[PDB]
Design a protein around this motif. Structure first.
Motif, PDB file in Angstrom:
ATOM      1  N   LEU A   1       0.900  -1.139   0.053  1.00 43.86           N
ATOM      2  CA  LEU A   1      -0.163   0.098   0.076  1.00 43.86           C
ATOM      3  C   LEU A   1       0.802   1.291   0.013  1.00 43.86           C
ATOM      4  O   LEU A   1       1.784   1.396   0.872  1.00 43.86           O
ATOM      5  CB  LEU A   1      -0.962  -0.012   1.275  1.00 43.86           C
ATOM      6  N   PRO A   2       0.596   2.166  -0.836  1.00 45.47           N
ATOM      7  CA  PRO A   2       1.374   3.455  -0.629  1.00 45.47           C
ATOM      8  C   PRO A   2       0.810   4.129   0.641  1.00 45.47           C
ATOM      9  O   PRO A   2      -0.285   3.859   0.861  1.00 45.47           O
ATOM     10  CB  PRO A   2       0.913   4.208  -1.909  1.00 45.47           C
ATOM     11  N   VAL A   3       1.871   4.640   1.370  1.00 47.28           N
ATOM     12  CA  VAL A   3       1.425   5.139   2.573  1.00 47.28           C
ATOM     13  C   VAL A   3       0.455   6.557   2.630  1.00 47.28           C
ATOM     14  O   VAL A   3       1.164   7.529   2.167  1.00 47.28           O
ATOM     15  CB  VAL A   3       2.751   5.536   3.728  1.00 47.28           C
ATOM     16  N   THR A   4      -0.601   6.561   3.019  1.00 47.23           N
ATOM     17  CA  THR A   4      -1.300   7.891   2.813  1.00 47.23           C
ATOM     18  C   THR A   4      -1.328   8.245   4.278  1.00 47.23           C
ATOM     19  O   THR A   4      -0.548   7.935   5.276  1.00 47.23           O
ATOM     20  CB  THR A   4      -2.920   7.490   2.802  1.00 47.23           C
ATOM     21  N   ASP A   5      -1.844   9.407   4.436  1.00 47.26           N
ATOM     22  CA  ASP A   5      -2.022  10.339   5.756  1.00 47.26           C
ATOM     23  C   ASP A   5      -2.784   9.445   6.754  1.00 47.26           C
ATOM     24  O   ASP A   5      -2.520   9.392   7.911  1.00 47.26           O
ATOM     25  CB  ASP A   5      -2.546  11.433   5.689  1.00 47.26           C
ATOM     26  N   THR A   6      -3.821   8.551   6.263  1.00 48.40           N
ATOM     27  CA  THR A   6      -4.682   7.720   7.370  1.00 48.40           C
ATOM     28  C   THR A   6      -3.606   6.586   7.797  1.00 48.40           C
ATOM     29  O   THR A   6      -3.618   6.171   8.964  1.00 48.40           O
ATOM     30  CB  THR A   6      -5.743   7.191   6.666  1.00 48.40           C
ATOM     31  N   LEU A   7      -2.910   5.948   6.909  1.00 48.59           N
ATOM     32  CA  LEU A   7      -1.961   4.866   7.248  1.00 48.59           C
ATOM     33  C   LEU A   7      -0.815   5.228   8.019  1.00 48.59           C
ATOM     34  O   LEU A   7      -0.490   4.719   8.809  1.00 48.59           O
ATOM     35  CB  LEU A   7      -1.578   4.199   5.788  1.00 48.59           C
ATOM     36  N   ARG A   8      -0.518   6.488   7.680  1.00 48.99           N
ATOM     37  CA  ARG A   8       0.857   7.231   8.467  1.00 48.99           C
ATOM     38  C   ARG A   8       0.509   7.299   9.814  1.00 48.99           C
ATOM     39  O   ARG A   8       0.973   6.844  10.744  1.00 48.99           O
ATOM     40  CB  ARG A   8       1.209   8.416   7.926  1.00 48.99           C
TER      41      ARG A   8
END
Ligand SMILES: OC[C@H]1O[C@@H](O)[C@H](O)[C@@H](O[C@@H]2O[C@H]3CO[C@@H]([C@@H]2O)[C@@H]3O)[C@H]1O
Ligand SMILES: [Ca+2]
Length: 740
Positions: free
Chosen positions: A553-560
C-alpha cells in the motif's frame, strides 16, 4: 583507460548536478606538478547537512566491457579542513554501494573505487572478513574504503555517481580532476598474505610510532608510566564533578538537573557533572579470527538463560584438549598471520574462541587477541594474570590524567569498584521470547515486547546488572541494549517497518500484533470503517486478524497516522518494561535509554524513550551535531547523551579509518575537538562517549570484522598522543564552557 571528465574544455558539465554547493573550473596544480583545469567544488556544508555533486548521464553508462576496472578521481581539499567524501554509485536498477575516504589539504592524489574484479569477485565485509581490505595491487593511489551496499552493480547501466559531504561542522572545498575508468592491474595473489606481525601490527607498512621490538615496547611503557601519577585534573570533586559549584542538593547518586538553561548531571555529592570517556574498556572485542577451529565436543555450550550475548562474553580460556583438535577452517584467515604461538608458548593464553559471529567468513572459531598478548609483553607477571590488574590500574590512571570524567559503556565489571572514576553500566535484554521485525533488522530481530517472557528476561537482565554494580554511587547509570532496529528514516515505509511487517502476520501467537489489532478495533470499531480508512476490501476483523499485506500500500495520511499509533504503542511498551526492570533492581540509578543510531531513531520511539528514560541516549557517527538535525531536542527538553562517536585515520597502518575519517592522527584530534565542541554547545547534552578505547584488530574483530582506527590506544597499548592532547583540551573546558 577511459577519461570521463578532465575539465580541459573549461566547462562545468551539464550532466553534473550540485546540491548546496557551488562549482566552477579553476586552474590548480595537479598530481604531475603541472597547472591543469579542475572542478572546484565549494560545498555549503556548515549550513546544510547534505552537500555534494552527482554525475547523472542522460542514459546510464554501459560499462559492461569493464570486467575488471575501477573508477578514478584526482581530489584534493582546499582551505582549512580535510573533507570526508561519501562516494555513492547507483546502477539502473536502484542498487547502490557506498565507499568513503578522507581528502587531505595539500597534495593532490588519485582515489579509486573498484567497479568489478579482484576482491569484488548482514555481511558488510569483503570475503576476507575485513570490513575493508588492503589494496589488491601496489600503487601510490588511494583506495576508497568499503562502507556498505551492493558489491556487484549491474555495470550495463550505471545511473548515478555521487560525491557528498554530510553533517559537517564546516564549509568544505575540494578540487577534482581526471575522472576516469582504468582496467585493474593484475591482482597481487599475496594481498591477504602475511598481514600481521607478532605484535598485531601491519607487517607490510612501517609508519610513525610502529613497534619494531620488545625493547621499544618497554621504552614506550617506561616513558608513559613516568607521567601517570594517578592525579585528576584540577577542581574535580571526588566523583569527577566541578568543585567550583554552584553545589546542588546531594542525593548520594548521579542524577539530572537543568542548571541555568543547560542540562547537566549532578554527582552524588551535589556537584555539577558532565560525562566524558571511552566505550569498550574491556578485552572481549579485541580478538581476531585466526582461521582455525576445534572439535565441537570439546567446546562448552552457551546456557539458554545467559544474559550476555556472545560478542560481549569474556575471552574464553581455550583448553589443551580443545587445542589438540585444532584444524584449518579458513586458509585465507590463517595466511594473514605471520606469528601465532604454539600451545606451549607463554602467550598462548591469549587465544579465544567464539561460538557465533554476526558477519564474516566463519560462523565460529579460534580467535587471538594481540592487544591482550601485548599487555603481557608490556607488564609481565608477578603472579598469574597480573598484567590484567596492571592494565586496569594504568587504564584508570590514564583516564584521570586525560581528564575524562567516566568510564563509558561496556566497561568490564572488574572496574566497577575502582572507586576513583565513575563508570556507566550496561545489560542486553536477550533470550527466547517471541520477536517482531522492522523488515530491515540490522543487529538482530526486534523483541516482541508484549510477550510476557520479554519482561521475564528484562527482569533477569536488570537483576544481573544490579549484582555487578552493588548499588554503588560510582555508577552514573545503566544503558540497556544498543542500536535496535526500531525503523529507518529513509522513507515512511522504512520508518514504519515494524507496524508494516507485523500487520502482515496473524494475531494468533504474535502478542505485539494482538496489541496493534486491539488499538485499530478501538479506533475503527467495524471492519467497514477500517476498509474505508485503508482502502481495503476485507470481509471481517477475523480476516484482518489473519494478516494483511500493507507493504504493497502506498502510505497515505491515514495509514501514516495508524502506523504512528502502532509504533508509539510498541516503543511505549518496550521502554515501560525495560524501565520497570531497571527501577525494580536499581531504584537509585539513572536509566539511560537504548542508544539510538541515526538509522533507528523514528520520532515515535524517541518520544517513548523521553517518557521513561532519565537520559535519552543517541549514537552519532558524524563530524558533529548539526543544528537542524538536532532541533527536535528542544521539544523534548530531555537531558541527552552521546553514547558513541569516533574519528579514524589511515597513517598508522590501519586498512579502515572507521565511520568518520581524518587526514592524519593530528587531523583526528582536530575533528575530535570540533565534535566535542558541538556537544558542549548543545544545551540538551550531558555527555559524550567515544567508541572506543582501543583500535579494532587490523584483521577485524571476531564479531563482525570491523577493523578500524578508532582507539585512544593502538594494538600495542600505546596511546595516540594527538588524541590524548585533544581529549585534555576538551576535558579542561567542559565545565567552564557549560557553567560560565
Ligand atoms: O548497510 C547498513 C548501513 O546503513 C547505513 O545507512 C548506516 O549508516 C550504517 O550505519 C552503521 O551501522 C552499524 C555498523 O556501524 C555503525 C554504523 O552506524 C552501526 O553500529 C549501516 O547500518
Ligand atoms: Ca584537467
Amino acid at each position: 583507460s577511459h577519461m570521463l571528465f578532465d575539465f580541459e574544455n573549461d566547462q562545468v558539465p551539464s550532466n553534473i548536478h550540485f546540491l548546496n554547493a557551488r562549482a566552477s573550473i579553476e586552474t590548480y596544480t595537479g598530481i604531475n606538478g603541472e597547472p591543469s583545469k579542475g572542478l572546484k567544488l565549494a560545498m555549503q556544508s556548515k549550513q546544510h547537512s547534505y552537500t555534494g555533486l552527482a554525475i547523472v548521464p542522460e542514459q546510464p553508462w554501459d560499462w559492461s566491457e569493464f570486467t575488471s576496472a575501477s573508477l578514478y578521481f584526482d581530489i584534493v581539499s582546499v582551505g582549512d579542513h580535510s573533507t570526508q567524501f561519501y562516494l555513492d554509485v547507483t546502477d539502473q536498477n536502484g542498487a547502490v554501494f557506498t565507499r568513503s575516504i578522507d581528502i587531505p589539504v595539500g597534495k593532490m592524489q588519485s582515489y579509486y573505487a573498484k567497479l568489478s574484479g579482484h576482491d569484488l569477485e548482514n555481511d558488510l565485509n569483503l570475503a576476507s572478513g575485513l570490513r575493508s581490505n588492503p589494496p589488491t595491487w601496489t600503487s601510490d593511489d588511494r583506495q576508497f574504503v568499503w562502507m556498505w551496499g551492493v558489491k556487484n552493480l549491474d555495470l550495463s547501466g550505471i545511473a548515478k555517481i555521487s560525491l557528498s559531504v554530510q553533517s559537517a561542522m564546516h564549509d568544505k572545498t575540494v578540487i577534482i580532476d581526471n575522472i576516469r575508468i582504468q582496467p585493474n592491474p593484475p591482482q597481487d595473489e599475496n594481498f591477504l598474505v602475511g598481514l600481521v606481525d607478532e605484535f598485531g601490527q601491519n607487517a607490510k607498512v612501517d609508519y610513525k610510532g610502529k613497534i619494531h621490538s620488545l625493547e621499544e615496547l618497554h621504552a614506550a611503557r617506561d616513558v608513559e608510566l613516568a607521567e601517570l601519577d594517578g592525579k585528576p585534573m584540577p577542581s574535580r570533586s571526588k566523583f569527577g564533578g566541578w568543585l567550583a559549584g554552584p553545589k546542588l542538593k546531594a542525593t548520594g547518586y548521579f542524577r539530572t538537573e537543568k542548571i541555568n538553561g543547560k542540562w547537566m548531571l549532578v554527582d552524588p555529592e551535589g556537584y555539577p557533572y558532565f560525562a566524558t570517556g571511552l566505550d569498550i574498556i574491556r578485552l572481549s572485542n579485541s580478538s581476531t579470527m585466526t582461521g582455525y577451529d576445534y572439535d565441537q565436543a570439546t567446546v562448552a555450550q552457551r546456557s539458554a538463560d545467559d544474559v550476555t550475548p556472545e560478542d560481549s562474553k569474556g575471552l574464553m580460556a581455550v583448553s589443551e584438549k580443545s587445542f589438540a583438535t585444532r584444524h584449518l577452517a579458513s586458509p585465507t584467515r590463517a595466511a594473514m598471520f605471520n606469528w601465532l604461538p604454539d600451545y606451549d608458548h607463554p602467550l598462548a593464553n591469549h587465544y579465544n574462541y567464539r561460538r557465533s559471529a554476526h558477519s564474516g567468513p566463519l560462523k565460529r572459531g579460534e580467535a587471538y587477541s594481540f592487544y591482550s598478548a601485548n599487555l603481557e609483553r608490556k607488564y609481565g607477571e608477578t603472579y598469574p594474570g597480573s598484567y590484567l590488574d596492571k592494565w586496569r590500574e594504568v587504564t584508570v590512571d590514564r583516564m584521570l590524567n586525560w581528564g575524562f570524567t567516566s568510564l563509558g559503556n561496556w566497561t568490564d565489571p572488574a572496574y566497577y569498584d575502582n572507586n576513583r572514576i565513575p563508570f556507566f553500566a550496561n545489560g542486553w535484554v536477550i533470550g527466547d521470547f517471541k520477536t517482531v521485525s522492522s523488515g530491515a533488522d540490522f543487529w538482530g530481530a526486534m523483541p516482541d515486547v508484549f510477550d510476557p517472557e520479554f519482561k521475564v528476561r528484562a527482569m533477569e537482565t536488570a537483576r544481573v546488572v544490579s549484582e555487578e554494580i552493588k548499588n554503588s554511587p560510582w555508577c552514573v547509570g545503566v544503558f540497556i541494549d544498543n542500536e535496535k532496529s526500531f525503523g529507518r528514516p529513509d522513507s515512511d515505509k522504512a520508518q514504519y517497518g515494524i507496524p508494516i511487517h507485523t500487520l502482515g502476520r496473524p494475531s494468533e501467537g504474535v502478542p505485539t500484533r494482538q496489541a496493534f489489532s486491539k488499538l485499530l478495533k478501538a479506533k475503527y470499531k467495524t471492519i467497514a470503517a477500517l476498509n474505508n480508512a485503508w482502502g481495503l476490501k476485507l470481509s471481517s476483523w477475523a480476516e484482518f486478524d489473519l494478516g494483511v499485506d500493507v507493504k504493497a500500500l502506498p502510505v497515505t495520511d491515514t495509514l501514516r497516522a495508524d502506523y504512528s499509533m502502532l509504533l508509539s504503542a510498541y516503543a511505549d511498551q518496550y521502554f515501560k518494561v525495560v524501565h520497570g526492570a531497571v527501577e525494580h533492581y536499581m531504584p537509585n540509578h539513572l536509566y539511560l535509554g537504548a542508544r539510538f543510531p541515526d538509522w533507528g531513531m523514528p520520532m515515535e520511539v524517541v518520544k517513548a524513550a523521553a517518557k521513561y528514560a532519565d537520559v535519552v541516549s543517541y549514537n552519532s557517527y558524524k563530524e558533529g551535531l548539526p543544528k537542524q538535525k538536532w532541533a527536535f531536542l528542544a521539544e523534548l527538553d530531555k537531558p541527552s547523551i552521546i553514547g558513541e562517536f569516533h574519528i579514524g585515520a589511515m597513517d598508522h597502518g590501519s586498512y579502515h579509518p572507521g565511520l568518520i575519517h581524518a587526514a592524519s592522527q593530528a587531523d583526528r584530534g582536530e575533528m575530535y575537538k570540533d565534535y566535542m565542541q558541538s556537544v558542549i554547545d548543545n544545551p540538551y547534552f550531558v555527555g559524550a562517549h567515544w567508541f572506543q578505547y582501543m583500535d579494532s584488530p587490523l584483521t577485524g574483530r571476531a564479531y563482525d570484522g570491523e577493523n578500524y582506527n578508532v582507539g585512544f590506544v593502538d594494538v600495542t597499548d600505546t596511546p595516540y598522543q594527538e588524541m590524548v592532547d585533544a581529549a585534555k583540551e576538551v576535558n579542561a573546558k567542559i565545565y567552564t564552557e557549560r557553567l560560565g
